Short mmCIF file of C-alpha atoms in Angstrom, two decimals:
data_model
loop_
_atom_site.label_atom_id
_atom_site.label_comp_id
_atom_site.label_asym_id
_atom_site.label_seq_id
_atom_site.Cartn_x
_atom_site.Cartn_y
_atom_site.Cartn_z
CA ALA A 1031 -36.54 -10.18 1.72
CA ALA A 1032 -36.59 -10.53 5.50
CA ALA A 1033 -33.02 -11.80 5.89
CA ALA A 1034 -31.91 -8.81 3.79
CA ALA A 1035 -33.28 -6.55 6.53
CA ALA A 1036 -32.32 -8.81 9.45
CA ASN A 1037 -28.62 -8.34 8.67
CA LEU A 1038 -28.94 -4.54 8.35
CA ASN A 1039 -30.70 -4.59 11.73
CA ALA A 1040 -28.11 -7.01 13.16
CA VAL A 1041 -25.22 -4.66 12.37
CA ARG A 1042 -27.06 -1.58 13.72
CA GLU A 1043 -27.36 -3.25 17.15
CA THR A 1044 -23.62 -4.03 17.23
CA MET A 1045 -22.71 -0.55 15.97
CA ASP A 1046 -24.64 0.95 18.86
CA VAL A 1047 -22.99 -1.32 21.44
CA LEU A 1048 -19.70 -0.20 19.86
CA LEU A 1049 -20.95 3.37 20.08
CA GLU A 1050 -21.57 2.89 23.79
CA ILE A 1051 -18.04 1.52 24.16
CA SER A 1052 -16.89 4.56 22.13
CA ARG A 1053 -18.61 7.04 24.42
CA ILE A 1054 -17.68 5.49 27.77
CA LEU A 1055 -14.04 5.89 26.79
CA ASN A 1056 -15.21 9.30 25.47
CA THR A 1057 -12.90 9.46 22.51
CA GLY A 1058 -13.59 12.60 20.49
CA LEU A 1059 -14.80 10.54 17.51
CA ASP A 1060 -18.44 10.42 16.42
CA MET A 1061 -20.63 7.96 14.50
CA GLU A 1062 -19.80 9.30 11.02
CA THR A 1063 -16.05 8.98 11.61
CA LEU A 1064 -16.73 5.60 13.21
CA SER A 1065 -18.46 4.47 10.02
CA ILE A 1066 -15.20 4.96 8.14
CA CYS A 1067 -13.04 3.32 10.80
CA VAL A 1068 -15.22 0.18 10.90
CA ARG A 1069 -15.17 -0.13 7.08
CA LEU A 1070 -11.37 0.21 6.93
CA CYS A 1071 -10.71 -2.68 9.31
CA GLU A 1072 -12.97 -5.14 7.50
CA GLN A 1073 -10.57 -4.96 4.55
CA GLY A 1074 -7.72 -5.20 7.07
CA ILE A 1075 -5.51 -2.31 8.25
CA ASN A 1076 -2.97 -1.74 11.07
CA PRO A 1077 -4.62 0.02 14.07
CA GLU A 1078 -1.29 1.53 15.06
CA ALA A 1079 -1.22 3.13 11.60
CA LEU A 1080 -4.74 4.61 11.68
CA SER A 1081 -4.11 5.89 15.20
CA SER A 1082 -1.13 7.81 13.80
CA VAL A 1083 -3.17 9.83 11.29
CA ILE A 1084 -5.94 10.43 13.79
CA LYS A 1085 -3.47 11.58 16.45
CA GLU A 1086 -2.01 13.89 13.81
CA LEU A 1087 -5.27 15.22 12.37
CA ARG A 1088 -6.89 16.07 15.70
CA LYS A 1089 -3.96 18.38 16.45
CA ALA A 1090 -4.05 19.60 12.84
CA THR A 1091 -7.70 20.67 13.00
CA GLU A 1092 -6.59 23.22 15.61
CA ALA A 1093 -3.60 24.72 13.79
CA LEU A 1094 -5.86 25.20 10.76
CA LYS A 1095 -9.09 25.85 12.67
CA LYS B 1384 -15.83 0.95 -1.46
CA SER B 1385 -12.07 1.00 -2.11
CA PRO B 1386 -9.55 1.81 0.65
CA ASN B 1387 -7.76 4.79 -0.95
CA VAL B 1388 -10.88 6.94 -1.31
CA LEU B 1389 -12.02 5.78 2.15
CA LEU B 1390 -8.90 7.30 3.70
CA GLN B 1391 -9.72 10.55 1.89
CA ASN B 1392 -13.15 10.37 3.48
CA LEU B 1393 -11.42 10.06 6.88
CA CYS B 1394 -9.27 13.10 6.05
CA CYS B 1395 -12.41 15.09 5.20
CA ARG B 1396 -14.07 13.83 8.38
CA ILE B 1397 -11.52 14.92 11.00
CA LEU B 1398 -10.40 18.07 9.22
CA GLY B 1399 -13.22 20.47 8.44
CA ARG B 1400 -11.76 20.92 4.96
CA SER B 1401 -12.85 19.20 1.76
CA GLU B 1402 -10.77 16.88 -0.43
CA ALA B 1403 -10.11 19.53 -3.11
CA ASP B 1404 -8.64 21.87 -0.48
CA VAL B 1405 -5.98 19.61 1.10
CA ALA B 1406 -3.50 17.25 -0.57
CA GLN B 1407 -0.44 17.23 1.72
CA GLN B 1408 -2.36 15.51 4.52
CA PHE B 1409 -3.66 12.84 2.16
CA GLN B 1410 -0.06 12.49 0.95
CA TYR B 1411 1.06 12.04 4.54
CA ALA B 1412 -1.81 9.54 4.94
CA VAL B 1413 -0.71 7.41 1.98
CA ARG B 1414 2.80 7.63 3.44
CA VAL B 1415 1.78 6.27 6.84
CA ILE B 1416 -1.02 3.75 6.08
CA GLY B 1417 0.99 2.34 3.15
CA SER B 1418 2.71 -1.06 3.65
CA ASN B 1419 0.68 -1.35 6.88
CA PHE B 1420 -2.65 -2.41 5.35
CA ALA B 1421 -2.91 -5.30 7.85
CA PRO B 1422 -1.96 -5.83 11.52
CA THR B 1423 1.77 -6.35 11.99
CA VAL B 1424 1.07 -8.30 15.20
CA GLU B 1425 -1.16 -11.20 16.15
CA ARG B 1426 -4.58 -10.55 17.66
CA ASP B 1427 -5.26 -11.01 21.36
CA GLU B 1428 -8.79 -9.75 21.86
CA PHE B 1429 -8.78 -11.07 25.39
CA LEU B 1430 -5.83 -8.91 26.35
CA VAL B 1431 -7.32 -5.82 24.74
CA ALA B 1432 -10.44 -6.42 26.80
CA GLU B 1433 -8.10 -6.62 29.80
CA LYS B 1434 -6.40 -3.41 28.69
CA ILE B 1435 -9.64 -1.43 28.76
CA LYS B 1436 -10.15 -2.90 32.23
CA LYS B 1437 -6.55 -2.10 33.22
CA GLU B 1438 -7.09 1.43 31.90
CA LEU B 1439 -10.43 2.14 33.57
CA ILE B 1440 -9.19 0.87 36.93
CA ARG B 1441 -6.09 3.05 36.40
CA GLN B 1442 -8.41 6.02 36.01
CA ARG B 1443 -10.52 4.73 38.94
CA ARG B 1444 -13.57 4.64 36.65
CA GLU B 1445 -14.18 1.10 37.87
CA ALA B 1446 -17.94 1.09 37.18
CA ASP B 1447 -17.60 1.56 33.41
CA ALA B 1448 -15.16 -1.36 33.26
CA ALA B 1449 -17.90 -3.59 34.71
CA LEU B 1450 -20.22 -2.00 32.14
CA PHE B 1451 -17.76 -2.94 29.39
CA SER B 1452 -17.82 -6.47 30.85
CA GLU B 1453 -21.43 -6.72 29.65
CA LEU B 1454 -20.93 -4.82 26.38
CA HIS B 1455 -18.24 -7.34 25.39
CA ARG B 1456 -20.79 -10.10 25.95
CA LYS B 1457 -23.16 -8.21 23.64
CA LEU B 1458 -20.31 -8.11 21.11
CA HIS B 1459 -20.10 -11.90 21.27
CA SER B 1460 -23.89 -12.33 21.35
CA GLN B 1461 -24.52 -10.51 18.08
CA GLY B 1462 -21.47 -11.74 16.16
CA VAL B 1463 -21.65 -9.71 12.96
CA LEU B 1464 -17.98 -8.86 13.40
CA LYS B 1465 -14.93 -10.90 12.54
CA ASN B 1466 -12.49 -8.09 13.39
CA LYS B 1467 -13.22 -7.37 17.04
CA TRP B 1468 -9.52 -6.84 17.75
CA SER B 1469 -8.95 -4.02 15.26
CA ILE B 1470 -11.64 -1.50 16.26
CA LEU B 1471 -11.24 -2.12 19.98
CA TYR B 1472 -7.45 -1.84 19.79
CA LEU B 1473 -7.97 1.34 17.76
CA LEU B 1474 -10.46 2.76 20.25
CA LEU B 1475 -7.97 2.04 23.02
CA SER B 1476 -5.26 3.69 20.91
CA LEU B 1477 -7.23 6.94 20.55
CA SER B 1478 -7.73 7.12 24.34
CA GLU B 1479 -9.14 10.36 25.70
CA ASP B 1480 -9.97 11.30 29.30
CA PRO B 1481 -13.67 11.63 30.12
CA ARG B 1482 -12.47 13.56 33.23
CA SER B 1483 2.61 5.43 34.30
CA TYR B 1484 4.04 2.29 32.67
CA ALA B 1485 3.20 -0.23 30.00
CA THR B 1486 6.84 -1.06 29.38
CA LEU B 1487 6.45 -3.94 31.83
CA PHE B 1488 2.89 -4.72 30.81
CA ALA B 1489 2.53 -7.18 27.98
CA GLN B 1490 2.30 -6.06 24.37
CA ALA B 1491 0.86 -7.64 21.25
CA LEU B 1492 2.47 -10.78 19.82
CA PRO B 1493 5.20 -9.38 17.56
CA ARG B 1494 6.05 -12.42 15.33
CA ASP B 1495 9.78 -12.12 15.96
CA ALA B 1496 9.87 -15.91 16.48
CA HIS B 1497 8.24 -16.63 13.11
CA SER B 1498 9.33 -15.81 9.58
CA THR B 1499 6.80 -13.24 8.38
CA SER C 638 -5.31 19.60 -38.81
CA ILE C 639 -6.33 17.80 -35.62
CA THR C 640 -7.97 15.04 -37.71
CA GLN C 641 -4.57 14.60 -39.39
CA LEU C 642 -2.83 13.84 -36.09
CA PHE C 643 -5.29 10.96 -35.78
CA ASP C 644 -3.85 9.58 -39.01
CA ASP C 645 -0.37 9.73 -37.48
CA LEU C 646 -1.71 7.87 -34.43
CA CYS C 647 -2.80 5.17 -36.88
CA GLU C 648 0.66 5.32 -38.46
CA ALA C 649 2.65 4.69 -35.27
CA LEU C 650 0.35 1.95 -33.90
CA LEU C 651 0.33 0.02 -37.20
CA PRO C 652 3.73 -0.57 -38.85
CA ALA C 653 4.11 -1.50 -42.51
CA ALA C 654 5.32 -4.84 -43.87
CA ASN C 655 -1.91 -4.89 -48.96
CA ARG C 656 -1.09 -2.09 -46.47
CA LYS C 657 -2.94 0.75 -48.09
CA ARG C 658 -6.54 -0.22 -47.30
CA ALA C 659 -6.15 -1.07 -43.61
CA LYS C 660 -5.10 2.45 -42.64
CA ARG C 661 -8.28 4.15 -43.90
CA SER C 662 -10.41 1.60 -42.01
CA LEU C 663 -8.34 2.23 -38.87
CA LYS C 664 -8.82 5.97 -39.50
CA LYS C 665 -12.57 5.29 -39.49
CA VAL C 666 -12.09 3.36 -36.21
CA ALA C 667 -10.22 6.37 -34.80
CA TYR C 668 -13.06 8.73 -35.72
CA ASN C 669 -16.04 6.55 -34.78
CA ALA C 670 -15.15 6.09 -31.09
CA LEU C 671 -14.24 9.69 -30.21
CA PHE C 672 -17.73 11.22 -30.25
CA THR C 673 -19.76 8.71 -28.21
CA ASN C 674 -18.51 10.10 -24.88
CA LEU C 675 -18.90 13.67 -26.15
CA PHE C 676 -22.60 13.13 -26.89
CA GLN C 677 -23.13 11.49 -23.48
CA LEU C 678 -11.37 16.44 -7.55
CA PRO C 679 -7.80 17.47 -8.46
CA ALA C 680 -5.39 15.66 -10.78
CA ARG C 681 -2.64 14.67 -8.32
CA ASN C 682 -5.08 13.11 -5.85
CA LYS C 683 -5.61 10.18 -8.22
CA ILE C 684 -1.81 9.79 -8.33
CA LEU C 685 -1.84 9.36 -4.54
CA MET C 686 -4.73 6.89 -4.82
CA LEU C 687 -2.63 4.83 -7.23
CA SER C 688 0.56 5.11 -5.15
CA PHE C 689 -1.42 3.61 -2.26
CA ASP C 690 -2.03 0.29 -4.02
CA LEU C 691 1.68 0.15 -4.85
CA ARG C 692 2.51 0.46 -1.14
CA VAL C 693 -0.14 -2.18 -0.38
CA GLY C 694 1.70 -4.49 -2.76
CA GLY C 695 5.08 -3.74 -1.17
CA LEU C 696 7.66 -2.01 -3.46
CA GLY C 697 8.26 1.17 -1.46
CA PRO C 698 10.75 3.20 -3.57
CA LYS C 699 8.53 3.04 -6.66
CA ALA C 700 5.72 4.84 -4.81
CA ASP C 701 8.33 7.18 -3.32
CA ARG C 702 9.50 8.00 -6.88
CA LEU C 703 6.02 8.41 -8.36
CA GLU C 704 5.23 10.93 -5.64
CA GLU C 705 8.64 12.54 -6.19
CA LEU C 706 8.00 13.42 -9.81
CA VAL C 707 4.51 14.96 -9.55
CA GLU C 708 5.78 17.07 -6.64
CA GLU C 709 8.40 18.70 -8.88
CA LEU C 710 6.20 18.86 -11.98
CA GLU C 711 3.90 21.06 -9.87
CA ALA C 712 6.80 22.99 -8.32
CA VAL C 713 1.06 19.12 -19.45
CA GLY C 714 -1.77 18.90 -16.95
CA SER C 715 -3.95 17.32 -19.63
CA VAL C 716 -1.40 14.69 -20.68
CA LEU C 717 -1.02 13.00 -17.28
CA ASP C 718 -4.84 13.04 -17.29
CA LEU C 719 -4.50 10.61 -20.21
CA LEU C 720 -1.95 8.38 -18.44
CA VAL C 721 -4.23 7.67 -15.48
CA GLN C 722 -6.81 6.54 -18.06
CA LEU C 723 -4.31 4.36 -19.96
CA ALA C 724 -2.97 2.72 -16.80
CA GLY C 725 -2.52 -1.04 -16.60
CA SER C 726 -3.03 -2.08 -20.21
CA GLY C 727 0.43 -1.55 -21.65
CA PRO C 728 3.80 -3.27 -21.42
CA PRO C 729 5.64 -2.74 -18.11
CA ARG C 730 22.49 -5.59 -6.44
CA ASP C 731 21.71 -3.30 -3.52
CA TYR C 732 23.57 -3.84 -0.25
CA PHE C 733 21.95 -1.19 1.95
CA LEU C 734 18.72 -2.97 2.94
CA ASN C 735 19.65 -6.35 4.47
CA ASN C 736 23.43 -6.12 4.12
CA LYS C 737 24.76 -4.28 7.17
CA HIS C 738 28.39 -4.67 6.05
CA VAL C 739 28.46 -1.28 4.28
CA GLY C 740 27.52 2.19 5.47
CA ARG C 741 28.86 4.61 8.06
CA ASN C 742 27.71 3.83 11.62
CA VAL C 743 25.14 1.28 10.40
CA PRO C 744 21.81 1.07 12.29
CA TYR C 745 21.74 -1.31 15.23
CA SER C 746 18.71 -3.58 15.26
CA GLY C 747 20.28 -6.84 16.27
CA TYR C 748 20.10 -9.23 13.29
CA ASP C 749 17.84 -10.10 10.35
CA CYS C 750 16.24 -13.31 9.16
CA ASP C 751 12.86 -11.93 8.02
CA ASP C 752 13.88 -9.73 5.09
CA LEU C 753 17.01 -11.72 4.23
CA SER C 754 14.57 -14.52 3.36
CA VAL C 755 12.76 -12.18 0.93
CA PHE C 756 16.17 -11.30 -0.48
CA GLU C 757 16.35 -14.77 -2.03
CA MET C 758 12.87 -14.32 -3.50
CA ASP C 759 14.22 -11.24 -5.29
CA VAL C 760 16.42 -13.68 -7.22
CA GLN C 761 13.86 -16.50 -7.20
CA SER C 762 11.52 -14.50 -9.45
CA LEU C 763 14.37 -14.11 -11.95
CA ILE C 764 15.18 -17.83 -11.72
CA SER C 765 11.50 -18.59 -12.32
CA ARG C 766 11.37 -16.22 -15.30
CA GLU C 767 14.47 -17.38 -17.18
CA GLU C 768 13.19 -20.97 -17.08
CA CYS C 769 9.84 -19.91 -18.54
CA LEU C 770 11.68 -18.60 -21.60
CA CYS C 771 13.18 -22.04 -22.22
CA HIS C 772 9.75 -23.59 -21.68
CA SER C 773 8.40 -21.27 -24.38
CA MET C 774 11.28 -21.93 -26.76
CA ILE C 775 10.99 -25.72 -26.59
CA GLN C 776 7.22 -25.45 -27.08
CA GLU C 777 7.17 -23.27 -30.21
CA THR C 778 9.51 -25.74 -31.93
CA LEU C 779 7.96 -29.00 -30.76
CA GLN C 780 4.89 -27.46 -32.39
CA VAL C 781 6.91 -27.67 -35.64
CA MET C 782 8.82 -30.95 -35.20
CA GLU C 783 5.59 -32.80 -34.42
CA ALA C 784 2.70 -32.31 -36.85
CA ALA C 785 1.38 -33.86 -40.01
CA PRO C 786 3.75 -32.47 -42.70
CA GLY C 787 3.26 -28.97 -44.08
CA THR C 788 0.44 -27.65 -41.90
CA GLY C 789 2.57 -24.80 -40.55
CA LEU C 790 4.13 -23.99 -43.91
CA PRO C 791 2.14 -22.78 -46.94
CA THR C 792 4.45 -24.79 -49.23
CA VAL C 793 1.70 -27.38 -49.71
CA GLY C 794 -0.27 -24.42 -51.10
CA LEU C 795 2.34 -24.16 -53.86
CA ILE D 753 30.43 -14.47 26.19
CA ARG D 754 27.62 -16.15 28.15
CA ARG D 755 30.14 -17.45 30.71
CA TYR D 756 31.17 -13.85 31.42
CA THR D 757 27.61 -12.48 31.73
CA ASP D 758 26.76 -15.32 34.13
CA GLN D 759 29.59 -14.19 36.45
CA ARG D 760 29.55 -10.40 36.33
CA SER D 761 26.01 -10.31 37.69
CA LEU D 762 27.35 -12.72 40.34
CA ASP D 763 29.68 -9.88 41.39
CA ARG D 764 28.59 -6.73 43.20
CA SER D 765 32.20 -5.49 43.13
CA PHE D 766 32.52 -5.46 39.33
CA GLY D 767 31.14 -1.93 39.47
CA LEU D 768 28.22 0.34 38.62
CA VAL D 769 29.92 0.61 35.23
CA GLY D 770 30.16 -3.18 35.13
CA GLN D 771 26.40 -3.42 35.44
CA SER D 772 26.34 -0.99 32.50
CA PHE D 773 28.80 -3.01 30.44
CA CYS D 774 26.85 -6.18 31.24
CA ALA D 775 23.63 -4.56 29.96
CA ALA D 776 24.87 -4.92 26.38
CA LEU D 777 25.88 -8.45 27.18
CA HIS D 778 22.28 -9.37 27.90
CA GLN D 779 20.96 -7.89 24.63
CA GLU D 780 23.77 -9.76 22.86
CA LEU D 781 22.37 -13.07 24.12
CA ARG D 782 18.70 -12.15 23.65
CA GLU D 783 19.10 -11.38 19.94
CA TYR D 784 20.98 -14.67 19.45
CA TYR D 785 18.05 -16.60 20.91
CA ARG D 786 15.64 -14.60 18.73
CA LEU D 787 17.63 -15.75 15.70
CA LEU D 788 17.51 -19.39 16.80
CA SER D 789 13.73 -19.02 17.12
CA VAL D 790 13.30 -17.70 13.55
CA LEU D 791 15.55 -20.54 12.37
CA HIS D 792 13.21 -22.94 14.18
CA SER D 793 10.11 -21.66 12.38
CA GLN D 794 11.38 -22.44 8.86
CA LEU D 795 12.57 -25.98 9.68
CA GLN D 796 9.38 -27.45 8.28
CA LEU D 797 16.41 -26.83 5.49
CA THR D 798 19.74 -26.38 3.69
CA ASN E 1376 11.12 28.09 -22.67
CA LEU E 1377 12.68 25.75 -25.21
CA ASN E 1378 15.07 24.61 -22.49
CA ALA E 1379 12.15 23.89 -20.14
CA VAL E 1380 9.89 21.99 -22.53
CA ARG E 1381 12.60 19.46 -23.40
CA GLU E 1382 13.21 18.68 -19.72
CA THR E 1383 9.48 18.51 -18.99
CA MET E 1384 9.17 16.20 -22.00
CA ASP E 1385 11.84 13.97 -20.46
CA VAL E 1386 10.25 13.87 -16.98
CA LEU E 1387 6.86 13.28 -18.65
CA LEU E 1388 8.22 10.01 -20.05
CA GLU E 1389 8.92 8.31 -16.71
CA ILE E 1390 5.42 8.80 -15.28
CA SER E 1391 4.01 7.36 -18.50
CA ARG E 1392 6.21 4.30 -18.10
CA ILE E 1393 5.59 3.61 -14.41
CA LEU E 1394 1.83 4.17 -14.71
CA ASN E 1395 1.92 1.26 -17.21
CA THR E 1396 0.42 3.08 -20.15
CA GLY E 1397 0.75 1.77 -23.69
CA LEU E 1398 2.75 4.82 -24.73
CA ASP E 1399 6.35 4.78 -25.88
CA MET E 1400 8.34 7.89 -26.90
CA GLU E 1401 6.76 8.32 -30.34
CA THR E 1402 3.14 7.92 -29.22
CA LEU E 1403 3.94 10.17 -26.23
CA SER E 1404 5.04 12.91 -28.64
CA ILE E 1405 1.89 12.40 -30.75
CA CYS E 1406 -0.30 12.57 -27.64
CA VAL E 1407 1.38 15.65 -26.13
CA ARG E 1408 0.97 17.44 -29.45
CA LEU E 1409 -2.65 16.28 -29.65
CA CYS E 1410 -3.55 17.48 -26.13
CA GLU E 1411 -1.92 20.84 -26.94
CA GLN E 1412 -4.80 21.62 -29.33
CA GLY E 1413 -7.32 21.41 -26.48
CA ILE E 1414 -8.91 17.98 -26.77
CA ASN E 1415 -10.36 16.33 -23.66
CA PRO E 1416 -8.01 13.41 -22.78
CA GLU E 1417 -10.74 11.12 -21.39
CA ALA E 1418 -12.00 10.93 -24.98
CA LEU E 1419 -8.53 10.08 -26.36
CA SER E 1420 -8.28 7.12 -23.96
CA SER E 1421 -10.99 5.30 -25.95
CA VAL E 1422 -9.74 5.88 -29.50
CA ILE E 1423 -6.28 4.60 -28.60
CA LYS E 1424 -7.74 1.34 -27.22
CA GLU E 1425 -10.03 0.95 -30.24
CA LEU E 1426 -7.05 1.35 -32.57
CA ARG E 1427 -5.11 -1.26 -30.60
CA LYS E 1428 -8.05 -3.67 -30.85
CA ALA E 1429 -8.67 -3.25 -34.58
CA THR E 1430 -4.92 -3.53 -35.25
CA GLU E 1431 -5.04 -7.03 -33.75
CA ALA E 1432 -8.14 -7.74 -35.85
CA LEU E 1433 -5.91 -7.82 -38.96
CA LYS E 1434 -3.18 -10.05 -37.53
#
C-alpha cells in the first residue's frame, strides 16, 4: 500500500535524527549496532544492563583484537 | 525477532568474532541482562534531556546542546517511538568524548516508596 | 537391530492392561514419521538462549544450575540435542534470602518489604494449588452422584 | 533515637567522632521512613 | 570408563528433567542407547511425539 511505505519512511527519519544525536555525543557505536539496540528496547530492557555489556565488550575487543 | 538471539547479534556486532567462536561472553551476557529485561526505575525523559544538556555544558560544547534542543523536538514531531527514555538513557550511558559529581545531582525514580 | 529399539520405545510409552494389535500399529506410527524429515551454531548456545527466558521469568538459581551442569559436562552430545527438541511438552524453607536473622556478618541494606511480600506468594501458590485438588475431587464425584442412573457404569449393558 | 540525633548535631562539642557516630543515626532514621513509605503504598491491610 | 558413564548417565537425567522433556529414566535409557547407533536426534523428536499422540488415540 502507501501506508505500508509511509511507516517505513517515518521510522527512517526518526532513526536518522537519533543517528545525529548518536554522533554529536560521538559514542563509538554505528548504525548497525544501533539497529540492535533500538530493537531490544521496544521489547523492554534495562539500559543500565545493556550499558554493562557494551562497556565490557568495547574493552574486550582490544584484549582479543 | 526474539531477544536471546538479538543479544547474540549484539555480541557479534561489538566483537569482531562470530557466534560460533565465542560462548563465554554470551554466557556473561545472559548473566547480566537476565532478570533485568525491563527498566528497574521509572522514566523521566525530561530529566534525561536535561542530562545531555548538563553534560554538554559540562564539556563546554554548548552549541550541540542547543542543537539537541531541536533534535528532541524532531523526536516529538515524528512520534514513531514509545520508548524515548530507553535509547536516550542508553546513549547517555555509553558516553564518549568527541574531544565531577552526580552524587548530588538527581537520579532516576527508584521505586523504594512503592511495592514493586 | 535399530528398528527393534523402536519397538521398545513403543513398549515403554504404552503399558499393558486386546493389547496385541495396538503395538504393531504403533510400530507403524514409529516408522512412518521418521523418514519425512530425512527426505526433506553450537549445542550449548541454545542452552544459554533457554536459560535467558528462565531469568526473564524470575527463578534465578534454576538458570544458575542449568548453566552449571553443561559447564561440567563439557569440562552424549547427541542426546541433549534431543532434549532441546523435546522441551516444554512433558510433565514438569530457605532463610537466606529475606530472613537476615541467620548468617555470619549478614549484609547491611537497611530493611526489606519488597521481596518479603513475594515471600508470601511463594506459599500462596501452594495454597492456591491444594484447593484446586479439592475442587477436582468434588467435581469428579458430583459427576457420579448426579446423573440419570447407570450412564457412567456399563451395568445397564449387562 | 531521634531525640538524640536532634541534639548531637545541635552540639559542636560532641566531637569529630560524634559527627561520625551521628552519621549512622541519620541512616537509621532514613530507612525507617522508607519502610513507612512502602507500608503506605500497599494500604489500598492486616 | 564404566565408572564415568554411570555418572554421566546420572547428570544427564537432571538436564532432561529441567528442560521439561517427556523423558523419564526408562525412556532416557532407550534414547541414549538409540542415539549411540548414530541416528540424527532431530528425527527422533518427531517419532516420540507421534507415538504419544497415537497412544492417546486408543484411550
